[PDB]
Amino acid sequence: ITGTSTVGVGRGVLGDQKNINTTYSTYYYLQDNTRGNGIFTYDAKYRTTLPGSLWADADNQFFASYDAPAVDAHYYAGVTYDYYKNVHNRLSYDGNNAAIRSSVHYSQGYNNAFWNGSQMVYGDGDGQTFIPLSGGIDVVAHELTHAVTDYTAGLIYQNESGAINEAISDIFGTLVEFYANKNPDWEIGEDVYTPGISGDSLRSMSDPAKYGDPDHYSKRYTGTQDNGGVHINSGIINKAAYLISQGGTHYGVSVVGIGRDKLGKIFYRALTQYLTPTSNFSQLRAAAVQSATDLYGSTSQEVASVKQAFDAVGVK
């Protein structure tokens, strides 16, 4: 909507206070004009029609429980925009400052979130398995990273290319979590998963096997569940990315860590310059090796560590 840029204040899903960029025209809308062509947050009002209504508020204060998922979807979309712009020189998900749209309160008791090809969508959870999923910055950044992937490599969402697609979203969801630097970790969704249980998460990058996901190519899932296991076999690539950043010895193979920033540079370059819609794990290894070679040189430690990491998870 056309109006003047304002700054509201509210509380997110975890009860933290934060300022949000809004737009005033009769009401205060969750419309941030400070980032590209805008960040827009919508109310789906417990239904499944999308996007729903641009979020309107009478007084620019967002402290109601009903407000919290909107506050966080809006705010963490901003953080994710800032990450891609400041760290990778990328302007929104299409690289040309496309408007970022999110809907919250999708359906009833909906234990998931997704990118639907056009926008981010967040359930409220059922209060047992999940609380509202926009409360997790790694979740928000995971979903928006699907938009980035769709505009760049375009990895098909099935089998190995789908597992790479998923891992890219977990990798950059995690790097955005570290960028924001509030209790960051290498786990996925811990802030919104199972409020009755402390210390768990939906997936682990540091130890995918903790939640039954493979950490080696030899344990890859080859059935048809989950689009050929895209959220399962992602553990193999997530482990490799973890090893590249943090180092470690895995099934006897030692990897020298090169840190998060270099992990991010290598995988961002692979994603945007080398991966294609049909890339498999072997081709991801080649893309990462070539990316690391471009950035640091063929005889660099960075290239050596990429190779060790993929060796360690059985991807040749």
Ligand X SMILES: CC(C)[C@H](N)C(=O)O
Ligand Y SMILES: N[C@@H](CCCC[NH3+])C(=O)O
Which residues have CB under 8 Å from 86's CB, separation 6+?
none
User: Applying CB under 5 A, does 159 fall inside the site for Zn ion?
Assistant: no
Number of residues binding to ligand KR, judged by CB under 6 A: 15
Q: Segment contacting ligand KR (CB under 6 A): 91-99, 110-118, 194-202, 287-295?
A: 91-99
Q: How far is the CB of 47 from ligand X (least distance, A)?
A: 19
User: Applying CB under 6 A, does 100 fall inside the site for ligand KR?
Assistant: yes
| Residue closer to ligand Y (CB basis): 111 or 293 | 111
User: Applying CB under 6 A, does 81 fall inside the site for ligand KR?
Assistant: yes
User: Applying CB under 6 A, does 37 fall inside the site for ligand KR?
Assistant: yes
User: Applying CB under 6 A, does 111 fall inside the site for ligand Y?
Assistant: yes
Binding partner of 113, given ligand X, Zn ion, Ca ion, none, CB within 5-8 angstroms per partner class: ligand X
| Residue closer to ligand X (CB basis): 33 or 112 | 112
**Residue with smallest beta-carbon separation from Ca ion:** 194
Q: How far is the CB of 114 from ligand Y (least distance, A)?
A: 7
User: Applying CB under 6 A, does 112 fall inside the site for ligand Y?
Assistant: yes
User: Applying CB under 6 A, does 114 fall inside the site for ligand X?
Assistant: yes
| Residue closer to ligand KR (CB basis): 31 or 201 | 31
Q: How far apart are CA 263 and CA 294, in angstroms?
A: 14
The number of CA neighbours under 13 Å toward the Cβ of 176 is 31
Binding partner of 112, given Zn ion, ligand X, Ca ion, none, CB within 5-8 angstroms per partner class: ligand X
**Residue with smallest beta-carbon separation from ligand Y:** 112
| Chain-centroid distance, C-alpha 300 | 29
Annotated binding site for Ca(2+): 57, 59, 61, 138, 177, 183, 185, 187, 190, 193-194, 197, 200
User: Applying CB under 6 A, does 167 fall inside the site for ligand X?
Assistant: no
Q: How far is the CB of 10 from ligand X (least distance, A)?
A: 23
143 is catalytic: yes
HEC string for the chain: CCCEEEEEEEECCCCCEEEEEEEEECEEECEECCCCCCEEEEECCCCCCCCCEECEECCCEECCHHHHHHHHHHHHHHHHHHHHHHHHCCCCCCCCCCCEEEEEEECCCCCCEEECCCCEEEECCCCCCECCHHHCHHHHHHHHHHHHHHHCCCCCCCHHHHHHHHHHHHHHHHHHHHHHCCCCCCEECCCCECCCCCCCCCEECCCHHHHCCCCCHHHCCCCCHHHHHCCCCHHHHHHHHHHHHHCEEECCEEECCCCHHHHHHHHHHHHHHCCCCCCCHHHHHHHHHHHHHHHHCCCCHHHHHHHHHHHHCCCC
Q: How far is the CB of 103 from ligand KR (least distance, A)?
A: 17
Q: How far is the CB of 245 from ligand X (least distance, A)?
A: 20
| Residue closer to Ca ion (CB basis): 59 or 181 | 59
**Residues 22-81 close enough to bind Zn ion by CB under 5 A:** none
| Chain-centroid distance, C-alpha 37 | 21
User: Applying CB under 6 A, does 69 fall inside the site for ligand KR?
Assistant: no
Which residues have CB under 8 Å from 96's CB, separation 6+?
none
Q: How far apart are CA 306 and CA 315, in angstroms?
A: 11
**Which residues of this chain interact with Ca ion, rule CB under 5 A?**
57, 59, 61, 138, 177, 183, 185, 187, 193-194, 197, 200
- Chain residues binding Zn ion by CB under 5 A are 169
Residues identified as active-site: 143, 231
